[PDB]
Amino acid sequence: HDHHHDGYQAPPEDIALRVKALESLLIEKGLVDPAAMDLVVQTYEHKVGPRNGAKVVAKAWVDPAYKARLLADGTAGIAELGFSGVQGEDMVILENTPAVHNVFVCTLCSCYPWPTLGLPPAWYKAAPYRSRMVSDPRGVLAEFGLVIPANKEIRVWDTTAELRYMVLPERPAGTEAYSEEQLAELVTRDSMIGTGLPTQP
């Protein structure tokens, strides 16, 4: 009952040394610049993450013209809030509605919209989620505490190409007149993957 293949298993005991050896090699050969690498790490540790997507969602909730632009051209839409680039070059936004619940996965690897959600969590990239989401989405969602009504369609999107998906979750009831900022606080990472719903006030 240890973790073995769910993404959270323990790495080899010597892994840090192996990594240091490769890094030293690549630096010695002049293939990589450690100062640039530090900036990449800072970018994904501190600058890029689900708070980006949450702003996008909150704006679409309060501004129907923005929502329309966003659904017509995801990349241009998210760029309006300054989000763009690596692993979000060609974005498609998936609108949840009372009739349709969207959720995405990458069965073949780990493809995920970095500019709006940051780097994916380990579970998203691991075999349990990837194998089962396309065959038994209701069973998987139940493990996250999410039960979709039997009459509501679930659409599972497998990210097999270079389009990247993000879910525009439905605005919770009872949030009349909330500012974009208060609305954004409700928008969880799971709600933008489709594996959860926004927080209910």
Touching other proteins, residues 109-138 (CB under 8 A): 109-110, 118-119, 121-123, 125-132, 134-138
CB of 142 to Co ion, least distance (A): 24
Tokens encoding 15? 């892994």
Residues 85-114 that bind Co ion (CB under 5 A): 106, 109-111
Q: Is 135 a catalytic residue?
A: no
Residues 79-98 that bind other proteins (CB under 8 A): 84-90, 92
Q: Is 106 a catalytic residue?
A: yes
CB of 95 to other proteins, least distance (A): 13
Report what 179 binds from other proteins, Co ion, none; CB cut-off 5-8 Å by kind.
none
Contact 175, 183 (CB under 8 A): yes
Contact 170, 67 (CB under 8 A): no
CB of 132 to Co ion, least distance (A): 16
Written in H, E and C, the secondary structure of 33-89 is CHHHHHHHHHHHHHHCCHHHHHHHHHHHHHCHHHHHHHHHCHHHHHHCCCCCCCCCC
The values of phi and psi at residue 148, to 5°, are: -85, 135
Written in H, E and C, the secondary structure of 89-145 is CCEEEEECCCCEEEEEECCCCCCCCHHHHCCCCHHHHCHHHHHHHCCCHHHHHHHCC
Q: By C-alpha distance, which of 101, 96, 91 is closest to 159?
A: 91
Distance CA 59, CA 81 (A): 9
72 lies in the site for other proteins, by CB under 8 A: no
How many residues belong to the chain? 201
CB of 179 to other proteins, least distance (A): 27
CB of 181 to other proteins, least distance (A): 23
Residues 103-162 that bind Co ion (CB under 5 A): 106, 109-111
Q: Is 191 a catalytic residue?
A: no
- In terms of CB distance, is 69 or 132 closer to other proteins? 132
Report what 68 binds from Co ion, other proteins, none; CB cut-off 5-8 Å by kind.
none
Of 32, 62, 71, 81, the residue at the interface with other proteins (CB under 8 A) is 32
Footprint of Co ion on this chain (CB under 5 A)? 106, 109-111
Q: Which active-site residues does the annotation give?
A: 106, 109-111
